[PDB]
Ligand binder design. Structure first.
Ligand SMILES: CN(C)C(=O)c1ccc2c(c1)c(Oc1c(Cl)cccc1C(F)(F)F)nn2-c1ccc(C(=O)O)cc1
Length: 244
């Protein structure tokens, strides 16, 4: 009739562990390297690469980032304990939204640059892709998320919830997911209360804004994959087979 703290704390620690063990670079690396910016002629060299050459670097970086999120989902309590159809559903709808959220770590809102291939640069680095609106939309959204000053525990718990969402169309075991969700919600709210950050709940990006930016992103990557497929060693082949 009253909440159990030890279980909640165990869940928080476990999510935050899985998150740490499934990030490309640690937040410390990205933050120190902030002063390491692309020179004007390094910029130039990227701008003079062909559309398809930039696409394959970007697509590879993006696919690897989806793989890391797949890994994160497999390590979450109960996810592996859940039917294959449901796992695919959660990941098909969710993994790229998590990737887009993770980006805020690599983004510096001070000079509006991101870390790409060892150094920081603005959106002009990607000019050969001819994806101006989309890239600026991505930058805008990272800039929005930056103004929240997430900790890594916050990103961990929040991206866990972006993924574990019982409203995704086509789930079978819906009640199991609701339960994993509610537990994640108690874990997140607990942690935020501990750190005096509860007031960020109401400031999180509206759900519709994450969805739209993801739809736009994915629509674009699909056209590019049709026009110039990159070749991928699938880590979750039944998920992969549903999109490629
Ligand atoms: C559709 N959507 C809303 C998602 O959240 C979602 C989920 C998984 C995605 C992708 C997107 C996705 O996007 C890509 C990437 Cl990263 C690179 C080239 C093409 C695409 C895609 F065509 F949009 F699917 N790969 N991709 C992916 C990458 C690798 C594996 C694998 O190794 O098993 C599986 C899926």
């Amino acid at each position: 009739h009253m909440a159990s703290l030890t279980e909640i704390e165990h869940l928080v620690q476990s999510v935050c562990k899985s998150y740490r063990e499934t990030c490309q670079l640690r937040l410390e690396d990205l933050l120190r390297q902030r002063s390491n910016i692309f020179s004007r002629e390094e910029v130039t060299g990227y701008q003079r690469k062909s559309m398809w050459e930039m696409w394959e670097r970007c697509a590879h970086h993006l696919t690897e980032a989806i793989q890391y999120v797949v890994e994160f989902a497999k390590r979450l309590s109960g996810f592996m304990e859940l039917c294959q159809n449901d796992q695919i559903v959660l990941l098909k709808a969710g993994a790229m939204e998590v990737v887009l959220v993770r980006m805020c770590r690599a983004y510096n809102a001070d000079n509006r640059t991101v870390f790409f291939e060892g150094k920081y640069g603005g959106m002009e680095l990607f000019r050969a892709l001819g994806c101006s609106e989309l890239i600026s939309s991505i930058f805008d959204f990272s800039h929005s998320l930056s103004a929240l000053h997430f900790s890594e525990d916050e990103i961990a718990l929040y991206t866990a919830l972006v993924l574990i969402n019982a409203h995704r169309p086509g789930l079978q075991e819906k009640r199991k997911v609701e339960q994993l969700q509610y537990n994640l919600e108690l874990a997140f709210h607990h942690h935020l209360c501990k750190t005096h950050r509860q007031s960020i709940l109401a400031k999180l990006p509206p759900k519709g804004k994450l969805r739209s930016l993801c739809s736009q992103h994915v629509e674009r990557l699909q056209i590019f994959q049709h026009l110039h497929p990159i070749v991928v060693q699938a880590a979750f082949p039944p998920l992969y087979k549903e999109l490629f």
